[PDB]
């Protein structure tokens with residue numbers, strides 16, 4: 214008859230809870246393309262203060278972690294603090310450790326102390342190597358140092374067992390261990406020196422490595438002696454089939470968090486840009502682009518603009534210059550939208566001229582060329598506009614005509630383009646891009 218306990222310690226800050234869904238999508242794209250799976254994921258935070266940690270802890274952390282929250286921290290901290298099981302896929306050095314330590318500290322702190330007959334622990338962190346266990350435990354101590362109500366003992370192989378037994382004699386709220394040693398300690402002396410009965414929180418870090426180094430049997434047996442309503446988080450740089458299979462076995466309604474696994478834009482889309490200095494130059498490029506394309510002759514294009522007034526203007530402009538377009542926007546009667554869409558889907562080598570906001574929902578097949586005439590200002594809009602050309606192997610090209618003053622636009626391009634896409638273009642255009650993006654970035 215299990216003892217009930219609290220796992221959700223998260224109070225969403227007002228400023229975060231005010232965020233809309235579109236805002237949250239955008240924040241995830243900007244944070245190195247965070248991808249989530251699972252139901253009910255809390256919104257990412259962007260500041261240590263949105264987590265409701267005491268001043269002590271705040272001072273301590275800062276001290277402990279210098280600079281901005283990492284993408285993994287932004288998303289994993291509120292999900293774990295909320296008591297959810299979590300799969301966190303991110304590289305070593307992404308700061309993942311505090312992502313689980315803070316919530317673990319909080320959870321263990323809240324539980325009643327160990328009785329005079331209870332060994333502990335309440336929290337268990339498993340690592341595949343002695344070197345990682347020691348590193349994790351060093352972190353832990355930087356927090357248990359201030360607070361004498363909480364101990365951690367590090368239990369690994371390649372190290373005296375008797376030494377660690379002397380520790381565990383005194384009871385311990387937290388254990389950091391390699392799987393073999395832990396199992397060895399559990400079974401030792403009728404399992405009377407270490408109990409699993411009070412473990413409510415298990416973390417497995419570098420989880421892919423645990424299978425690599427043959428620990429499936431040990432970690433599987435450990436999870437079998439742990440209450441199944443425990444909170445469990447699995448952190449790993451990769452997600453091999455073995456881990457995927459293990460998570461299904463040990464987790465409930467997990468939230469998976471993957472940081473920039475793949476590119477925000479399909480890698481088969483060829484992203485390009487041209488930096489211009491007047492609307493006129495932008496228009497000169499747009500025309501050169503439309504003619505040039507013909508020498509490579511389905512093959513259709515879509516010019517994206519930012520407003521209905523711009524769409525009308527550019528439509529007339531392009532007309533006066535011998536180029537006929539199928540123009541579309543929400544200020545036009547639906548009947549003529551349909552006429553233009555059908556004309557576009559009908560006529561060979563047609564050109565659609567469309568507002569960026571209608572891009573996600575356009576009912577047309579993928580195209581060979583997207584010309585973004587007004588650099589978009591969000592990551593979400595960039596994905597929807599460029600995605601109009603995405604088509605696995607048959608993906609075409611998306612090109613942005615950017616103006617010298619469009620700093621945020623350059624920030625987006627610098628974050629969504631592949632490095633090798635920026636290399637193949639003129640090194641001065643490239644250099645301006647990076648300068649534009651840096652200026653925007655320090656602008657905040």
Ligand code: NI
Nearest residue numbers: 488490617645
């Ligand atoms: Ni310039």
